[PDB]
């Protein structure tokens, strides 16, 4: 009834706990005890949706519950609106031992996970993710991070949470548009590390669109699994988890923020790295129409903005514009479940690969 | 010459303390021709050190930026780091990078944060220029900006690639901060080195003259003893707090800058001592040796007149480091409220 994953990585070890009505399970916020104190980080738009549930099921279970209500935005993911955070930390007398929960999305995740790593230089952390991107994303990994106005998460710390709490039902609310963003996550994982899984996509997409439980908490289950494999390997092999990013940036880049959403310029990117695949000759097209296949039935686009031409992405896609750069690095698919990375790759392989769609 | 290698956490860092050690070659290794360095002052250290240690850098091959904050302990705040990051960002210093806190104690605070914050962590040099950041802050790994309710409430444990201690730069330390240094070397000697104590009777007077060869010794022997017991906190570590909870209350009462911190801990520390007999736990013939030591280093032995006994407790507010003997030190849990009073 209930999935779970247990994660082990930087000399620490965590679960992440994958079921329908977690939120009310016996200790569903393990380690959190009775006699202990929480603070519930969110923002505006969850607040009123599962604030007072997650406050009330942890005060049953005797924990004193404070909480900080943040601005719904990735505008609002900065250094300032986390000091507010240790404000309200610091009015209510939280001392180390006190544990902070971030019930949100990948921006509240982050956020919340820096405030925790920087609390009196570090206090106990537990992920309430809500979006399905943070579900199989943000749960694994440690990277915490707010933007500057100069760059996006250039601050921030490597922490691991206590434990990763996964009710399906706040999906039920979850904007569908997100959830395909997130399902673009879930599918790279298939084709960068597990065809089995891609395989196993390929069968089950329309009751992950659905929302069937059984098909969302597996789901969950096996990417939090193929994360957690691929960072334990490396600590560039986490360099693997960009596949579609370097063509996908130039579209966030080139359209701006909030108009593609992250996981629509990977799932367009992941497309035009398989066709960068075809081109130096390590892909067939019949590889790459399962991944259009799978991507169209997620909803999710498989063709880049009309708005842009092949030289309006090399300009992003570059590592830098210096003298002694200009390069492009990217990950391609080997297979469906296999990948590399490659540096150096032609431009001339990159336009092509662009104007193929 | 002097060096201490300090390992903990599974990593390793050295110390090198030596006088015209800013000019030396590879004085501010593990920094390489090619690499970049970002140093950061405060409006005080910058016309004395800074543009010196630029150009023993330029010369070595690696190019540097720089950004001088100003001079006090209110600047060791989330939007002063802040300005940190926008100064690494616009000079475009990517995860290769060097922060290098040229200052004491505050700029070493800050700068050790953004360096564990910048990027999740780049690489990090210390050159601290007081005597109480090279006898404390060199070694521990806390870094840390303030909060408006709290101090040193946002930060992070960050060790450094090395400490580099040109004992020069005391040179130009105001004497009542080099005293104010001495208050937390004489800590070490009364909780847990008595031959070191003993040697600080001994050489106090050149300590005070800026002896290299005396300071040299000495600020070795300081990191040696803290990268003991922050070895052994992996349960100790709570000694280094002798004093400072006396301490914490006069600074607390009296307000920053008119007692410097060691001045309110070496008060704090006879007031400990007096207490700790009071209880049956230290002699007051030992006593005198710590009250005479302090003195000759012109630290207060008083607590103001300023302040009743009754003023010292609200912030007090139980949980005492007291010595045992000089050399040795326990915490010990529940005191008597009225021995504290009654030691004043
Ligand atoms: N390794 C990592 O730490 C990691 C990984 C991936 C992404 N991230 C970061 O996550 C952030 C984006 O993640 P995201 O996809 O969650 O965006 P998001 O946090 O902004 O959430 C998307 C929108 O949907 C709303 N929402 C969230 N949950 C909802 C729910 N149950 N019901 C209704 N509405 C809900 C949110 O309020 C928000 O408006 C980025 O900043 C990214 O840098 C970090
Ligand atoms: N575990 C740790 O990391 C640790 C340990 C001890 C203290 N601290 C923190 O450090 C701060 C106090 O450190 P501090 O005692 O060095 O105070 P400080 O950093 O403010 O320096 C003392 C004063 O003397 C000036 N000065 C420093 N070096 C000089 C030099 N060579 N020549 C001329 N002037 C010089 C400084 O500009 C400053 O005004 C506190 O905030 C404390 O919390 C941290
Ligand atoms: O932020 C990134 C990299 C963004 C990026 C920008 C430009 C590029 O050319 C690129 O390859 C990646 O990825 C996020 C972190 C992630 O790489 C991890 O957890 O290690 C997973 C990924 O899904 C996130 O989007
Ligand atoms: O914890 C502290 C803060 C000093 C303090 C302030 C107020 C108090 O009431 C108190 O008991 C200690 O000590 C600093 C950190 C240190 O313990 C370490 O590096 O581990 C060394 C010590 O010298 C610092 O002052
Ligand atoms: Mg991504
Ligand atoms: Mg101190």
């Known amino acids: 009834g209930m999935e779970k994953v247990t994660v082990t990585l930087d000399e620490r070890s965590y679960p992440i706990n994958i079921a329908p009505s977690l939120y009310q399970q016996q200790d569903a916020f393990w380690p959190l005890t009775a006699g202990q104190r929480a603070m519930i980080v969110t923002n505006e738009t969850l607040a009123p949706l599962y604030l007072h549930k997650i406050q009330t099921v942890l005060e049953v279970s005797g924990v004193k519950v404070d909480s900080i209500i943040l601005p719904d935005g990735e505008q609002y993911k900065s250094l300032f609106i986390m000091n507010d955070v240790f404000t309200a930390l610091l009015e209510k007398h939280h001392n180390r031992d006190t544990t902070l929960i ?31 991107l943070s579900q199989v994303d943000s749960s694994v990994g440690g990277k915490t991070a707010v933007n500057h106005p100069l760059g996006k998460n250039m601050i921030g710390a490597f922490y691991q949470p206590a434990s990763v709490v996964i009710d399906l039902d706040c999906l039920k609310t979850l904007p569908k548009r997100e959830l395909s963003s997130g399902l673009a996550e879930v599918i790279k994982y298939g084709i960068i590390l597990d065809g089995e899984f891609f395989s196993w996509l390929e069968e089950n997409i329309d009751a992950l669109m659905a929302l069937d439980n059984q ?92 708005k842009m031409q092949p030289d309006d992405y090399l300009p992003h896609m570059m590592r830098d514009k210096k003298v002694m750069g200009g390069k492009l690095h990217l990950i391609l698919p080997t297979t469906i479940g296999h990948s590399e990375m490659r540096s150096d790759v032609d431009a001339s392989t990159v336009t092509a690969a662009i104007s193929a769609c």
């Open 102 to 132: 971030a019930l949100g999305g990948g921006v509240i995740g982050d956020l919340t996970g820096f405030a925790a790593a920087s609390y009196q230089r570090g206090v106990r952390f537990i992920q309430v993710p809500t979006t399905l």
């Open 215 to 306: 098909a969302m908490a597996y789901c969950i289950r096996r990417c939090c699994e193929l994360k957690a494999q691929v960072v334990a390997a490396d600590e560039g092999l986490r360099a693997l988890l960009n596949l579609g990013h370097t063509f996908g940036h130039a579209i966030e880049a080139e359209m701006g923020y909030g108009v593609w959403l992250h996981g629509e310029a990977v799932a367009a990117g992941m497309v035009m790295a398989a066709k960068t695949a075809e081109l130096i000759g390590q892909f067939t097209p019949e590889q790459t129409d399962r991944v259009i296949a799978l991507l169209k039935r997620a909803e999710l686009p498989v063709t880049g903005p009309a």
